[PDB]
């Protein structure tokens, strides 16, 4: 707030890939849908993905969007990306939620 503005909201179950056990796991520990924002830090022209579980408001994801990021729209409702530290997945609750977020993500990547 003050420093950033949200540029989208989308309904998704946020998951992270467990490389060691070759499975997706729920981000933050609990399975459930979250409200996932992309937030724009207006001053630096930087963007960050932040999500909070609907039920308890726990932040399950808070990861910058780096320049050049490769965003994989594997399916119409499941998109994923990586960093040096994690692989992230968004299991969106509809195709509308996916295109809203995907659309927001692509704009940010074009603007970085």
């Amino acid at each position: 707030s003050m420093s950033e503005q949200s540029i989208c909201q989308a309904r998704a179950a946020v998951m992270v890939y467990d490389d060691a056990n070759k499975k997706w796991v729920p981000a933050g520990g609990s399975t459930g849908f979250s409200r996932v924002h992309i937030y724009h830090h207006t001053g630096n022209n930087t963007f960050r993905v932040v999500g909070r579980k609907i039920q308890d408001h726990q932040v399950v994801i808070n990861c910058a969007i780096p320049k050049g990021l490769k965003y994989n729209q594997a399916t119409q409702t499941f998109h994923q990306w990586r960093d040096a530290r994690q692989v992230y997945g968004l299991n969106f609750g509809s195709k509308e939620d996916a295109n809203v977020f995907a659309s927001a993500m692509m704009h940010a990547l074009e603007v970085l």
């Binding site: 890939y17 997706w24 994989n72 594997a74 399916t75 499941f78 994923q80 990586r82």
Partner: peptide
């Protein structure tokens, strides 16, 4: 990019 969850 690992395959989706299910």
């Amino acid at each position: 990019x690992p395959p989706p969850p299910x």
